[model samples]
Target: KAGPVQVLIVKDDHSFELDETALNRILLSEAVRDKEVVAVSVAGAFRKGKSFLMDFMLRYMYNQESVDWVGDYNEPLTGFSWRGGSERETTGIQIWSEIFLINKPDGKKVAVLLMDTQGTFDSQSTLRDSATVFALSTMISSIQVYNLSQNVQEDDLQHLQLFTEYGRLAMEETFLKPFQSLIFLVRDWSFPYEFSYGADGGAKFLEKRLKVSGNQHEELQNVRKHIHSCFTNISCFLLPHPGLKVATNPNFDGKLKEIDDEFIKNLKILIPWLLSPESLDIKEINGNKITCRGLVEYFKAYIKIYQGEELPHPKSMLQATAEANNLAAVATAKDTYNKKMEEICGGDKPFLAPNDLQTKHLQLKEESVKLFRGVKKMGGEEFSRRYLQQLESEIDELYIQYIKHNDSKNIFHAARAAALEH
Candidate 1:
């Protein structure tokens, strides 16, 4: 005989239920076929839109219609006591909820558990919540850190400090070793120029806050170091709030339209990245290029390339190069090198062709053009010039025929003909 199967359903308000049949189905499926749970924790400072973010994620995973059940908590369980319905607000407590034992259409028996924790601070309740977050962090496979700062203000900095402190402590306590990914959601983000002056305005503000050492009291300096190290594995992205609004409502027109337009623009920039796994991984190295490896590296390389021996740390390499003597000589040398490369690669060729074929064709065309120009300048016979023109026309027609025939018949033949014609 099999052991009693149980399905544990926890909700946002800390209410839970157990279902035997549902538990049996999930356990039986997992027993029959090997599968694992994919758990993710949604954690951040309070009112940074943690709940709203989780709601968005849940809706994305289970379809919008199914989210109504999240509010009611009825679809997942049938018989349950209303200790206080789902309407009750969870103060400093995190909710651990799981959808058990349903085979997705793709035949994967997987459970998606979402751990929604409350905001963090220095108070007792906040500390206790942090402990809960730390414990859950160990269990979760991934974490989505939501940093929804519309603008970097003092309050935002303080909240960020608390978040970093708790996160660092959590990691140190072995609460986040198995975590596979970190996704940073930047909410209500705007271009730096739109809100501030200079290139480093927003980023500089972020760096300063992350480096601040006064938040943890006795553990201040140690916490700052930990904060710096903790962000190494995280991948960051900005999610401008989606600008969908109820246009038909007259009362909401002016305010909603303004908000919606801004949200739409931000969302347009954000949605493409959020939907793609490649976009989420900032550390991903592709071929020779590093994707989203921060702006500091580019600045350093730029200085080294242009200033050469005279390059100065934290100084303008562009200014140094502009003021340097014999700059025109360097420019001329660069231009000559580029021209030589152009000739070698047949960059002057009329049509796009393979390098070797293009080089040969360009050489032949250069000789022919020189002869034609000389004849025309000397008032030589028009037929002599026209002959070269006719040949050029024939060459174009033959190239088209060659391409079409081989393109329709065989790609190898097309390549061969292209090489021969050029």
Candidate 2:
């Protein structure tokens, strides 16, 4: 029932479009509900096997329960539309249609979403398009796995610095970090003799690349500082090549047999660690966990922010998140009011007199306010005040509708009494 669905598309005109239909089908479906969401997105340069790695992640996600979750020997790996031949096959941002639900160590249920972004730094797309795709993917995901080939280059650091620096400035006031977990997954490392393989080696390699000296240029030092400031957690993983057959073989459909035993062997350790309860980060806004439905609103708001040609200001991004959260708060509060009102007056509940009905309405309104308070408010005090005002009016309006229905019910009962007497 689930497969890869393109949520964001880059048109021939060089404009970006969010596939609203696909977004709704995945995130807004009734099955998703209000559980907290964890988005794991992969992004990087073209031909770096970003999608190639994603398929392995998908395999692990689907079969984590089994003893050998990696699957059978002859079975070809199939997920997230990977190909060995081309560099720019996947365009736009694609998300897995199915949301994998799992219980955290704390017994909290969370919905996991896998995302694949269009490869960047290619001749086919402009730098702006590339930056936008990378920025959007990183901004939205809880775990942003940045796929790199060979080693962490100067260009990679510069590109990452450019994005996170702006993020730091935007979030300076609130003291909120711009991004969550960033995993630098380096593929095709040739220096196993120097740093070895796996996370232990990758960690040392990342430290060397990111370290700034007292003699280093000011701009380069700031680049390191900014990246450190933006992300709450920064980690790295080194991966061995998948082998010559998987890379050169056009017929290769990512079969585990075709891939090097080393790649599969390393994946055995990597996949479980990546998806582990301790590693998975629930999407959060202003210290509050965001629900699957809440994240859908964020997608809509964020896409609009990136629609323009220029990079969106960090403040604007903050504003967008705040506004989205505010709207969700109002919706949730209104829902509470409606549910409580329905319990009191709906279905076979007896009609109440005017005084009793008024008293009940006031009581429900107070309950709605309490539910609203439970939601973590975002942005400026004035901005949240305005949204609160909107909710108050909505609750008042709904109360009128319930009052009218109650009056009509009283009339029906009076008419029945007269007919019985007659």
Candidate 3:
């Protein structure tokens, strides 16, 4: 009986070289005891280090017992099939090999099947290869998604387009079902920018553009949506380039390493979770909900580790600050208005007499002007102040007419009663 197996592949050309001894140790310790078949697929845009990534991972897995070279025992193959016998072209290469542990210390044997594919986009051969991947995945238990983190530039446009297209095709061909997790390997991450906005923005823009273009190709549309939906279903984690090292020299004048070590430490905890069965569940919460609780928990834990303390309640702080600022602004405005009102109504003598018609006009004018100026000084625009003052003047005129009408009625009733025929 063979021990458990682990598979790794690189579909691009940009990955780092593998560390064979450590990989062999991990495999021998965990994999050899379980006796399982592990398969890995590396797919991405051309020259993105797909093959190099695979080579590193494979060498790490097999280079046990200080074996200096992997080529002596395993042969690496490159090329792809082409139809219509006019001519053939090789876009990339693949390697497949099995490791048989003969006369091992433990009473167990193991077989590891590893495949590295050529990266291609929007071609018939690519589609066929995609189908093959789908089939192979059904026989396996997990899958990993590798993405490189890099500064955005015009040069990366072609590769990004190819990656998006290939992802869409893979979804439609139903080639992603075998894998339980999607690991996103982010290379060459630095502390200055914990996240790269340029790369993320480009990805989001491409998704929107592809959806728009899907109007002509229904398959493309379905594939695009499916792949996006699948991303939510799987576990996604980041693996920063292992070669990163902090600059420790005293003479160096650069910014101190800002990449929080706690973040990387939490990432170590996250990888195992991705391989966990619970990571595959996709269920809606509330209306139009994206449940990112798992990812959120990881981030929270990372923050706690970095600060050596728990995070404060962010929602409470935001709500309290907003309410306090609003109250303060309102209080200030009200106080200013009351002081202005006191200045406007000086010496509190009744300005308008009930029956004194001439005095009523003077009182109305003074009050109207005072109110207008007070409001205007408190940031009221001139146009608004003039309109409101005009309305107040109109009300004064209506009041005089109401008083005259009542007096005339009283007089007419008294005269009629005195002349009544009894």
lDDT on C-alpha atoms for all candidate structures: 0.39, 0.82, 0.37
lDDT of 3 by residue, 1-422 (tens): 22222222224442212323333444344434344333344554333445444544444344434444223322431222211122222233333334323222434443333445444432434333432333223222135444455432332333333334433332224534322443444444443245432234334434443353545566455544544544433323334443322223323221213323543343334433432223322222121212222222222332233235332212222344544443444344434433433343323422222355344544654555455444423323433444444545554564555455444545555466568944
Q: Which window of 10 residues has the lowest lDDT sum in candidate 3?
A: 283-292
Candidates sorted on lDDT, descending: 2, 1, 3
The TM-score values for the models, in the order shown, are: 0.37, 0.71, 0.30
Off by over 4 Å in 3: 1-36, 63-93, 100-110, 122-141, 147-178, 188-192, 195-225, 228-233, 237-422
> 1 or 2: which has the higher lDDT?
2
Model 1 spans > 4 angstroms off: 1-34, 63-88, 91-112, 121-126, 134-141, 151-180, 190-224, 239-259, 268-422
Task: Identify the superior model by TM-score, candidate 1 or candidate 2.
Answer: 2
RMSD of 2: 19.2
Report the number of the highest-lDDT candidate.
2
Residue lDDT tens for model 1, 1-422: 22112233333443333343453343234342233343445555444545544543444344433423223322221111111112323233233333433354555554444445554442334243443343333223234454445554544444444544433333224433323455545565566444322213434545554555565565555544554544434445544543433223323222323345555344334333333333232221111222111212332332233234432222123333433322333333334433543454332333334454445544544554454444322223442444445545544443344334434544465568879998
361: Cα error in model 2, Å: 78
**Candidate 1 accuracy as TM-score:** 0.37
Backbone clash count for every predicted candidate, in the order shown: 0, 0, 20
